Paper text:
p50RhoGAP is a key protein that interacts with and downregulates the small GTPase RhoA. p50RhoGAP is a multifunctional protein containing the BNIP-2 and Cdc42GAP Homology (BCH) domain that facilitates protein–protein interactions and lipid binding and the GAP domain that regulates active RhoA population. The BNIP-2 and Cdc42GAP Homology (BCH) domain is present in 175 homologous proteins (such as BNIP-2, p50RhoGAP and BPGAP1) and regulates various key cellular processes. For p50RhoGAP, the BCH domain also maintains the GAP domain in its inactive form through autoinhibition via the β5 strand, which lies at the interface of this interaction. We recently reported that the structure of the YBCH domain contains two asymmetric monomers in the dimer, in which the monomers intertwine to form the dimeric BCH domain, with the direction of the polypeptide chain changing at Pro116.
Pro116 is located at a structurally important kink region in the BCH domain of S. pombe p50RhoGAP (henceforth called yeast BCH or YBCH). To understand the structural role of Pro116, we created a P116A substitution mutant of the YBCH domain, purified and crystallized this domain that diffracted up to 2.8 Å resolution. The YBCH P116A dimer superimposed with the YBCH WT dimer with a rmsd of 0.16 Å for 299 Cα atoms. Alanine in position 116 (P116A mutant) orients the polypeptide chain beyond position 116 in a manner similar to that of proline in the WT structure. Moreover, the hydrogen bonds and buried interface areas between the monomers of the dimer are largely similar between the WT and P116A mutant YBCH structures (buried area 2861.5 Å [WT] vs. 2882.3 Å [P116A]), which suggests that the scaffold of the dimeric BCH domain maintains its structure and thus function irrespective of the amino acid at that location. Collectively, these results suggest that proline, although known to cause structural changes in other situations, is not responsible for the kink in the polypeptide chain in S. pombe p50RhoGAP. Contrastingly, at the same concentration, the P116A mutant protein in AUC shows 70% dimers and 30% tetramers (dimer of dimers), indicating that higher order oligomerization occurs among the P116A mutant of YBCH. Despite the expected role of proline in changing the direction of the polypeptide chain, we surmise that position 116 has a minimal effect on the YBCH domain, and that our analysis of the structure of the mutated P116A YBCH suggests that this structure is representative of the BCH domain family members.
Author numbering:
A (entry chain C), D (entry chain D): 0 to 148
B (entry chain B): -2 to 148
C (entry chain A): -2 to 149
Write the structure that this text describes.
Amino acid sequence: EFEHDLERLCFIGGYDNDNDKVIVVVTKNLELFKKYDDINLIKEAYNHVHKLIQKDERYTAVFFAHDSTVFSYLGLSLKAYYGMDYYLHKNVKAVYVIHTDWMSKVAIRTLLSIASAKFTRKFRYLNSISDLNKYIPLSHLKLPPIVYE
Amino acid sequence: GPEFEHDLERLCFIGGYDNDNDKVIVVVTKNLELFKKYDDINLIKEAYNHVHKLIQKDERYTAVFFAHDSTVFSYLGLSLKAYYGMDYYLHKNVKAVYVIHTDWMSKVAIRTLLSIASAKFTRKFRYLNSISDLNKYIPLSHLKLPPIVYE
Amino acid sequence: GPEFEHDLERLCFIGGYDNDNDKVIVVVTKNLELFKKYDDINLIKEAYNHVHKLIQKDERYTAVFFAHDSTVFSYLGLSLKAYYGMDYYLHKNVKAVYVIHTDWMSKVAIRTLLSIASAKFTRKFRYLNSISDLNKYIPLSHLKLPPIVYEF
Amino acid sequence: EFEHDLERLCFIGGYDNDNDKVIVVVTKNLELFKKYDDINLIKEAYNHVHKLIQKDERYTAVFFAHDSTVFSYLGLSLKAYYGMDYYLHKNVKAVYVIHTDWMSKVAIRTLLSIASAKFTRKFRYLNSISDLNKYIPLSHLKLPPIVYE
């Protein structure tokens, strides 16, 4: 029975401290489904998550990305998570990706950081060293001569 | 070898401290050309490692990027791409970051738009290194976890 | 001046043809070095101008990015970024885009994620240069247009 | 009055051949509000547009971006368009942005080209020049000697 394989790829692991669902997906386990022939997978996957999250439920998603990357399993899991109906995106408290390779780590942090308004507000674009003196005193910094020419 | 770690310090270093006495780490972008002379090294990985020891896991700090003349490019482009894929704590804990470029608008017009179009969905995500880091956000006692987070 | 136009052709040129005799336009990325010598200029706008003369509107072609080098940069990210902000017809009409680089994944890992997370809404957009170009898609006779698209 | 300064920024300019609305936004016309004070502008705007597109209704949207960049007017009109309830994004058939400055044109084309799956499908990452031979024959190419060291 493959409905069991499909239950070790994605399952309800717990219920956090607010009593809302915490659904786990273990991306590396997308390899069990290679053994089947003439399957869809993403429709099987989509109707299964629909069985684990009904409409109106606020939940948390957690992706265990051990032994997968943006170019293999974690790529498709996340692409597939993005293709979900909007209510799944509206109703998540947070998505967690845990432990992937170095590439994908810095791929993810870049995407998240482009999206972090809290952070992109912190930038301040000045035209020369002179205009910095107002915020950080130039008498407080040892700098090479390159920054002065 | 050691010449490499010294070129790292000419690229990124603590220049001084502000009032409230916190680090002001500068990156003299330009100085990335010092690395063109090298054989095989993942520069960006070694550079992330250097910053990680310049600023420890909780201390508010300031960052400033110098890149005055245009050229091809000022490599300011690549320095902020690197800074954007850095650890999360380095973004939450930074007080302000100053770029000195003049022609900045042409650079960061693309990144301003990608930020505009960033979905509301993708602002919910957070990357974590080990599964222990997921505690504090969700207590792992509430959870059955797959056998791979165990030996 | 003329030296600048020559460094442009050393960077991006027509390389050859395939079948039915469609241009293969090579860009050797390591050749962005030639422009560090210069002062002033918007290199990115000059290169966009140069490609426009190398490939006319509706005409299929193949692109090849040569970046086998290493150190600070292969120049492949900077010239792929430049390629992504080119007019839509250059992307519709390219047959294939061969990027010759060893360590390529570590660069395009970031763009693969941004494409994954790109919304379906964003995919509905299109930039047009002039109000005239909109006629193709929605007929302008059907519409009241604000006086601003006019010059009474 | 002020409700009389919105129809000049957003109107149902007409209908396409398939008999669905087309909504014009003229991003420039957005300083007719610096003269008001108190006015929140963003919520009045959302209310106005909600009165031109009914919930179940497919439409087009065109942005006349004459005299605006990603750093003014056009940037806020798009940040605002992105802030809208999901049905406005599900329901558009297309979004046209017309005639902005060179920066923004390049910024817009870049975002769309990351989005465009048909485009990014066309890349093939070969490891060295030798592998290019199976696709484009090197008999056919004038190349500098650099591509061969």
